[PDB]
UniProtKB/Swiss-Prot annotation:
The gene is bamA. Part of the Bam complex, which is composed of the outer membrane protein BamA, and four lipoproteins BamB, BamC, BamD and BamE. This is Outer membrane protein assembly factor BamA. It comes from the Bacteria. Part of the outer membrane protein assembly complex, which is involved in assembly and insertion of beta-barrel proteins into the outer membrane. Constitutes, with BamD, the core component of the assembly machinery. Belongs to the BamA family.
Length: 388
C-alpha cells in the first residue's frame, strides 16, 4: 500500500527538442515541455509545437494512462494550427484552425486498442484562388463567392465524434520482420456543426519473412481513404486525402497525385496544382533483403529494399458531364505506379531514409520526384520535479 506514497509524490519534467529535414516537409522543428504527474494528479501535462515549410502547430496536451485501474486512458488537447497549402504543393489557401479533443482509450488486449472521443474545431480559410472543386464545396455550404475575387474568409465550427482501432503485432519497433499493423480512424460530424460529413481511413502493414533468419521479408502496405457529405453538403476540401511522396507513393512529388485545380479567370484554366480528393487508395509491395557488402556487425543498423508503389485519388463529386472538356477527376482508375530502391539506416544522428524511384505510370499534371530523403533526431532531457 505504501508505494502509493512514492508514486503520488514522483514527478518528472522533460524538455524535448527535435530537428529534421525531409523532401516532403522541408526543414522541421519540434519543441515540447512537460511534467508527467502534474500537481500529483496522475495526469501528464505538456506544451509542444512543430514547424514545417507548410505547417506550424501548437498544443496543450493533458493525458492520464490510468484513468481506471484497468488501463483505460483519458487524453485531451488544445491546439492551434496554421496550414499553408501551397507550400504543401497544393493549389493555394490558408487554413488557420484551433480546437480541442478529448479521447477515451481502451486496451482490449496486449495487441488491440480502441479509441472514442469528441472533438471541436474552428477553421478559418482565406487566400483561396477561385477554382472549381473548391468553389463547389463553398456553394454547397450556402456561400456564393465571386469567382474573379482572389480572396475569402470562410469560417466553420465543427464538433465531431471520433473513433479508432489499432491492431499491432509487429515483432520489432524499428526493423520489423513479421506480423501486421492495422489502423482505422474514423469521424463523423454531430448536430450543431457547420460542416456535415464523415471520414474514415484504413492503414495496414504486413511483414512476411521468407527465411528462418528473417533477413528476407516481403512487406505489403495499404492505405485507404473515403469521406463524404451528409445533407447535400460536401466533405470540406481542407480534409481531403493526398498521395505521392516518401510515405505513400515514392517517386512522386508530395501530394501531386489526383485531381488538379481548374481555375476561374480574373475562359477557365487547366493546371498542374493538386487539390486532393475525398477518396484515395495506395498500396505497396516491398522486398526487404540483406544489405550488401556491410557484414553482420552493422546488420540491423541498416535496411535495404526494392518496391513497387501505387495509388490514386479522386473527387467523387466532380461532375464530368459539365466539365466534358477537362479531365475526368472522378475516375478512380487513374492508378499511379513507381518502382524503386530504399535504404534505411539507424544512423548516429538518428533515423535516415533514402528513396530512389522511377514513376513508370504517371498522368498529365503529375510531378516527378525520384530522389527522396528523410532525416531527424530528438533530444530528451529529464528533471525530477518531486513533491517530497
Amino acid at each position: 500500500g505504501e508505494n502509493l506514497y512514492f508514486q503520488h509524490m514522483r514527478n518528472t519534467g522533460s524538455f524535448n527538442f527535435g530537428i529534421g529535414y525531409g523532401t516532403e516537409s522541408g526543414v522541421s522543428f519540434q519543441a515540447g515541455v512537460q511534467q508527467d504527474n502534474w500537481l500529483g494528479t496522475g495526469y501528464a501535462v505538456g506544451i509542444n509545437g512543430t514547424k514545417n515549410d507548410y505547417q506550424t502547430y501548437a498544443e496543450l496536451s493533458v493525458t492520464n494512462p490510468y484513468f481506471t485501474v484497468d488501463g483505460v486512458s483519458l487524453g485531451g488537447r488544445l491546439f492551434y494550427n496554421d496550414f499553408q497549402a501551397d507550400d504543401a504543393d497544393l493549389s493555394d489557401y490558408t487554413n488557420k484552425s484551433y480546437g480541442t479533443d478529448v479521447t477515451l482509450g481502451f486496451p482490449i488486449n496486449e495487441y488491440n486498442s480502441l479509441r472514442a472521443g469528441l472533438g471541436y474545431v474552428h477553421n478559418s480559410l482565406s487566400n483561396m484562388q477561385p477554382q472549381v472543386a473548391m468553389w463547389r464545396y463553398l456553394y454547397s455550404m450556402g456561400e456564393h463567392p465571386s469567382t474573379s475575387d482572389q480572396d475569402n474568409s470562410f469560417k466553420t465550427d465543427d464538433f465531431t465524434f471520433n473513433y479508432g482501432w489499432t491492431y499491432n503485432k509487429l515483432d520489432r519497433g524499428y526493423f520489423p520482420t513479421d506480423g501486421s499493423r492495422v489502423n482505422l480512424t474514423g469521424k463523423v460530424t454531430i448536430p450543431g456543426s457547420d460542416n456535415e460529413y464523415y471520414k474514415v481511413t484504413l492503414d495496414t502493414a504486413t511483414y512476411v519473412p521468407i527465411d528462418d533468419d528473417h533477413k528476407w521479408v516481403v512487406l505489403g502496405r495499404t492505405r485507404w481513404g473515403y469521406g463524404d457529405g451528409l445533407g447535400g453538403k460536401e466533405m470540406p476540401f481542407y480534409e481531403n486525402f493526398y498521395a505521392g511522396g516518401s510515405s505513400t507513393v515514392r517517386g512522386f512529388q508530395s501530394n501531386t497525385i489526383g485531381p488538379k485545380a481548374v481555375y476561374f479567370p480574373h475562359d477557365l484554366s487547366k493546371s498542374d496544382d493538386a487539390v486532393g480528393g475525398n477518396a484515395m487508395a495506395v498500396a505497396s509491395l516491398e522486398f526487404i533483403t540483406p544489405t550488401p557488402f556491410i557484414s553482420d556487425k552493422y546488420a540491423n543498423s541498416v535496411r535495404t529494399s526494392f518496391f513497387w508503389d501505387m495509388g490514386t485519388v479522386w473527387d467523387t463529386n466532380w461532375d464530368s458531364s459539365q466539365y466534358s472538356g477537362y479531365p475526368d477527376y472522378s475516375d478512380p482508375s487513374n492508378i499511379r505506379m513507381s518502382a524503386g530502391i530504399a535504404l534505411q539506416w539507424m544512423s548516429p544522428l538518428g533515423p535516415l531514409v533514402f528513396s530512389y524511384a522511377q514513376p513508370f505510370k504517371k498522368y498529365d499534371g503529375d510531378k516527378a520526384e525520384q530522389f527522396q530523403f528523410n532525416i531527424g533526431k530528438t533530444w530528451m532531457e529529464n528533471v525530477a520535479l518531486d513533491f517530497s
